[PDB]
Design a binder for this molecule. Structure first.
Ligand SMILES: Nc1nc2c(ncn2[C@@H]2O[C@H](COP(=O)(O)OP(=O)(O)O)[C@@H](O)[C@H]2O)c(=O)[nH]1
Lengths: 285, 336, 336
């Protein structure tokens, strides 16, 4: 699961050191850099086996709740019955194999309220307060004796989208525990270039693309307070669409500029269309 | 580098906003005056009582309050742990109008240049509003409040809060604020002056009728009947009476404050208003240019192109009532 | 934030000053262009030879040179130690005109933002002028040179030196300089535009006669015949021909550069010029408002108050000759 990741080698190695210690990392960054992709591959790296079963991934939204996450009482045919959640059940599998590493991906964690979701468990999920010693009876636990304890093997990876203006402040409860990490677009890297060279792409078109995108992304990052650095465009669009072996050329490129980048600029530049026309043209002209 | 005495400016803002002793305060600068009005102004409101607007609340509680929402109740199965989703009306002071006050006071405290007595009193008030939530203010918040449900008194301080927010700039420190040097820029001071008269005239000149009048060019063009490219022309004020009409163009210039050449560029607009304006009654047409001067006031009359036009000045910094007398004295002559 | 391409501005300055390949240079910014003209311009002069103005010298020397001043000779008793006070004419390049060049070049070198090739070449030139003395330049120095004894070529670069000196601001360092962002301010760019046309029109429109015309109000006032308070009115340009006269008011606005509402405030001045202007020949009276636009040029005609007036634009940034064609094309239509 490590053949072609566009990100530099430094961060991906640092993360593995960072993750094995802190165990709760947040990956920031713009949409379209494969935040789901990189985390998924890293999940296989930490285990050393490219196995999905140990790994589970969820997308958070505001109405995502403790009931789905851990324990809830959905009705059966006659009467209400407790139902195990995802994280609750997920950990029971990890308890079987303490030697192995089990991994949980939480996409768009900033969107939902963590407190309503984790509830009691948010104290445990920090790396220190782990194991049977810190076990507590659960919210819906009928019997006091049954408890839930986060095993040390579990590692949690979270994806946060920097691009949104609507976001103002990260949740406080999140920041105390998790170690935020910034993912650059990494449009100018050897590994991404080497991918395109393997595909039917001339060297000038590669440097043409890298040169043009860098200055464009640099422009958005340059206006620091008005727009965050994380607004800068990612690279996943250029990855996708070439599974058929199509040659990457200016003819193919102009579609992606028009289809994906153009509405994205419209949202980023909601003030002046003239200023948009300045930047749309340079990519092709 | 002459400017108006700051205490006098506040009176002009008052008519501009369309609605007390300022002699006591020793701080000439504007923010000292403005905060003392607000800081004292809030104290006036609480005596009568602040506005409490019923905010309906849909929440999950352990019991029946008001109206239970059956749908959300059953779907979330809240009945089982003895809870319902019920709608009721908590009474708070957490309204947008009241929230704005607290956020503004925080800015007032953070301001680097401010009287100590003023800052101390506000900090008490900030403590005295526990329930209300601080906010990061924008004009868009003020935009929502144009409905004006609130009382007449609330609208006064809210306009004050608008002045502070727009005229707040960070200074030495990251947190602290520093007030804008409002007087120095002519445009906003001029735009104040133009609004100052229009609302002023409605109050005192009850005899005459006062409205801003939109004007249309006499032109016709073969290319476009619209003539959109042509400049938009809307009077500053028109003060019409049965015996005589009068159009005024008033602006604040820095050059005129020096007692030489004269800056009367606005006059070029005036004649064109007279031309496009055609009276059905045909009583008369008159024009006035009035500017602010500091030392003294001088009045002239002219007969230019078949029009009787007056150029006049007012000695701002004199005294507010004598100024008020002077304004009525001035208009009385020309309104004839 | 759109502005004119900088290379085009230099052409407008040329007609403004009333008097080459700029394609070669790669630095778009103004100072790169301007220094290269000067740095290359000086090299043109030295080839022909720089001005040497006889400066008479009254000095104490050990011998007779020219005319001995008998009075100062005897009174100071300089005869005894074999000396006389004699008047003679040393020939130097140390004139005010030439001194100005060297001082300007020092500023050019000190400028923080400048092409390396440009700066290196000037430093050679600064060394190549050993006799001439550096100076701290003021407009008062330039004021003395309005006599224009110098040749026509000298006047060109001196005007260039005027532009640099006035548009020089210290930047990061105490010594170094940073160029003014000339394009951004409308007033000086506008005032350039107004002068640009007036000298331009004399060159190309040889058929017509072009002069700026002072105008007098038709007014009479009982108070003062002078009417000094009234605004001073002097045309931007008048371009009169036997068949038809035409007055133009041209100004540079930022709002118009965006392709909505239109900024045509200057028009209000225009009609009043038409009114005060009375033609003896009675051939016609016409008006033109011309503004700079970047993308495209659009022309309209109007019949407003018995006057035939045109509003038009020019696509600056297009090309200098096609612009020159467009200007002649434009005036030809209305001059009819
Ligand atoms: N092979 C490869 N695929 C990538 C890379 N980066 C992104 N992708 C793919 O881009 C697509 C979108 O990823 P993602 O960022 O999760 O979509 P998003 O939800 O819009 O942000 C997926 O197919 C990713 O695997 C990469 O570096 N290498």
């Amino acid at each position: 699961a490590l053949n072609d990741l566009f990100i530099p080698e430094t961060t991906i190695e640092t993360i593995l050191k960072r993750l094995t210690i802190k165990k709760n990392i947040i990956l920031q960054g713009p949409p379209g850099v494969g935040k789901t992709f990189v985390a998924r591959r890293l999940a296989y790296l930490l285990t050393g086996e490219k196995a999905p079963q140990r790994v589970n991934m969820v997308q958070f939204h505001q109405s995502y709740s403790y009931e789905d996450f851990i324990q809830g009482y959905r009705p059966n045919g006659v009467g209400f019955r407790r139902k195990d959640g995802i994280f609750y059940n997920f950990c029971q599998q990890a308890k079987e194999q303490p030697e192995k590493k089990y991994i949980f991906i939480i996409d768009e964690i900033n969107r939902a309220n963590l407190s309503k979701v984790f509830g009691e468990v948010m104290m445990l999920m920090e790396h220190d307060k782990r194991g049977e010693n810190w076990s507590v009876p659960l919210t819906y636990s009928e019997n006091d004796e049954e408890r839930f304890y986060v095993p040390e093997n579990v590692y949690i990876i979270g994806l946060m989208n920097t691009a949104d203006r609507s976001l103002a402040v990260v949740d406080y409860a999140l920041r105390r525990r998790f170690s935020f990490i910034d993912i650059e677009p990494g449009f100018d890297t050897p590994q991404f270039r080497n991918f395109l060279l393997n595909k039917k792409a001339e060297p000038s078109f590669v440097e043409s693309l890298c040169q043009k995108m860098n200055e464009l992304n640099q422009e958005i990052s340059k206006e620091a307070t008005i727009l965050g650095k994380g607004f800068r465009i990612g690279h996943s669009y250029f990855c996708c669409g070439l599974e058929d072996g199509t040659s990457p050329d200016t003819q193919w490129l102009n579609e992606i500029v028009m289809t994906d980048i153009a509405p994205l600029l419209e949202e980023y530049f909601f003030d002046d269309p003239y200023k948009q026309q300045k930047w749309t043209n340079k990519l092709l002209g | 580098q002459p400017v108006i005495p700051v205490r006098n400016i506040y009176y002009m803002l008052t008519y501009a906003w369309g609605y007390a002793n300022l002699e006591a305060i020793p701080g000439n600068n504007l923010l000292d005056i403005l905060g003392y009005v607000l800081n004292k102004g809030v104290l006036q409101l609480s005596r009568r009582g602040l506005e409490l607007d019923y905010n309906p609340n849909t929440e999950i509680i352990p019991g029946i309050k008001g109206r239970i929402e059956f749908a959300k109740t059953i779907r979330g199965f809240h009945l089982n742990h003895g809870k319902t989703v019920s709608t009721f009306d908590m009474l708070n002071e957490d309204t947008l109008a009241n929230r704005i006050i607290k956020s503004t006071l925080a800015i007032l405290i953070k301001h680097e240049k401010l009287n100590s007595t003023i800052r101390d009193e506000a900090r008490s008030l900030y403590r005295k509003l526990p329930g209300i939530s601080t906010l990061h203010l924008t004009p868009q918040h003020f935009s929502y409040l144009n409905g004006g449900k609130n009382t007449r008194y609330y609208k006064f301080v809210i306009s004050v809060c608008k002045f502070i927010v727009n005229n707040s700039i960070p200074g030495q420190n990251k947190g602290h604020y520093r007030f804008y040097d409002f007087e120095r820029n002519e445009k906003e001071m001029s735009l104040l002056y133009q609004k100052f008269l229009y609302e002023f005239c409605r109050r005192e000149l009850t005899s005459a009728n006062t409205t801003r009048s939109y004007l249309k060019w006499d032109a016709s063009s073969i290319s476009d009947q619209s003539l959109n490219l042509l400049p938009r022309m809307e009077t500053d004020i028109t003060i019409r009476s049965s015996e005589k009409i009068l159009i005024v163009d008033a602006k604040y210039y820095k050059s005129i404050f020096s007692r030489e050449k004269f800056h009367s560029q606005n006059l070029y607009q005036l004649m064109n208003y007279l031309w496009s304006l055609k009276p059905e009654n045909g009583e008369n047409i008159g024009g006035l240019l009035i500017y602010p001067h500091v030392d003294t006031a001088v009045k002239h009359r002219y007969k230019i192109n078949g029009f009787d036009i007056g150029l006049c000045t007012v000695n701002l910094g004199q005294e507010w009532p004598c100024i008020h007398q002077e304004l009525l004295d001035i208009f009385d002559e020309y309104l004839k």
